[PDB]
Write a protein that binds this DNA or RNA. Structure first.
Ligand SMILES: [Cl-]
Ligand SMILES: [Cl-]
Ligand SMILES: [Mg+2]
Ligand code: NA
Ligand code: NA
Ligand code: NA
Ligand code: NA
Length: 326
DNA sequence: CCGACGGCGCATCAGC
DNA sequence: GCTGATGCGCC
DNA sequence: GTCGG
């Protein structure tokens, strides 16, 4: 990657603002700048060159000049040395432990993997499973395994009810050669924006995937969103595959295109696209796109018959999934 | 300057 | 119990 | 931290 050094720096700064400073807008600012620099097709020669990009301002330009001059950032060098900042950053790598919980644990003298392991009773359920699979969850998933996972999910879903449609979204749908997890959008004709003609639609699917030992653990579960753990089966004599995070989202069927736009991401692409929507006078969520009235109040859902329709509303040329990895 | 910055599901908790 | 705030997660 | 009015 042309500007990998700079983008890593900015990502590290973002993480610090989120995890330690608890400054979500600074976090988003750094990530937006990292993303715009990541897609910039030249090797950046100066902060001023970078500043020409949307999302890079005066402060980041200065840091980019320092980084180009020396290969590092004193601000980060110092952060890397702060024990409290270090501990907090580490703890937040456990799924279910955020900035608040991490600072709280550190207060109690819980700040290593070893500490966490002996204090399981101090963890909620989500955290306990995040700890259980700490190592596994930091591994990426080769697209080849994603394909095997897709096959299992789609086929098990079909076995429950042939009218279910399951679509793998996330980085997979954007064509990534590896993914951090598996994202599954689910629809069923019994669940629309107008009616829920069937209960347990998500449950039945989760239950079936548990029955075949694909889903192994649950982080959280409700009527429309499942957040859990899954695992590919391994052959005789061979090492097991790592455990993987899986997210399943049941979306009203008539709202599939807004749903699939959302779940395809990336996260930054979504933020960017939704902010542009706001500027164009619309608001987009995973269900609908709606006009903003004069007062600045969301109007009624606009008709959408394709992903492209959404892009049209906000006056963007269509972008294929593979070009949304921001 | 300075308000806005994407939008929302599930878990947990305070207050009634 | 409920509702509203907040934490944490997803893209 | 950056943007736009
Ligand atoms: Cl902030
Ligand atoms: Cl809506
Ligand atoms: Mg994903
Ligand atoms: Na800029
Ligand atoms: Na975490
Ligand atoms: Na996910
Ligand atoms: Na803005």
């Amino acid at each position: 990657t042309l500007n990998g050094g700079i983008t890593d720096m900015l990502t590290e700064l973002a993480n610090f603002e989120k995890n330690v400073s608890q400054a979500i807008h600074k976090y988003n600012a750094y990530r937006k700048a990292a993303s715009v620099i990541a897609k910039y097709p030249h090797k950046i020669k100066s902060g001023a060159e970078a500043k020409k990009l949307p999302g890079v301002g005066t402060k980041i330009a200065e840091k980019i000049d320092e980084f180009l001059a020396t290969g590092k950032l004193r601000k980060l060098e110092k952060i890397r040395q702060d024990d409290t900042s270090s501990s907090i950053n580490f703890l937040t790598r456990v799924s279910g432990i955020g900035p608040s919980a991490a600072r709280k644990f550190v207060d109690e003298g819980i700040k290593t993997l070893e500490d966490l392991r002996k204090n399981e009773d101090k963890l909620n359920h989500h955290q306990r499973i995040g700890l259980k699979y700490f190592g596994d969850f930091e591994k990426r998933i080769p697209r080849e395994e994603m394909l095997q996972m897709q096959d299992i999910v789609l086929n098990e879903v079909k076995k429950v009810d042939s009218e279910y449609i399951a679509t793998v979204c996330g980085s997979f749908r954007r064509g990534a050669e590896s993914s951090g997890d598996m994202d599954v959008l689910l629809t069923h004709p019994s669940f629309t924006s107008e009616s829920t003609k069937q209960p347990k639609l998500l449950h039945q699917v989760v239950e079936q995937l548990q029955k075949v030992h694909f889903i192994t653990d649950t982080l959280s579960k409700g009527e429309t969103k499942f957040m859990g753990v899954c695992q590919l089966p391994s052959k005789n004599d061979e090492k097991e595959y790592p455990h993987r995070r899986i997210d399943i989202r049941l979306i009203p069927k008539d709202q599939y295109y807004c749903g699939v736009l959302y779940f395809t991401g990336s996260d930054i692409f979504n933020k960017n696209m939704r902010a542009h929507a706001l500027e164009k006078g619309f608001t987009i969520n995973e269900y609908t796109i709606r006009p903003l009235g004069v007062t600045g109040v969301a109007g009624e859902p606009l008709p959408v018959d394709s992903e492209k329709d959404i892009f049209d509303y906000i006056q963007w040329k269509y972008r294929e999934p593979k070009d949304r990895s921001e």
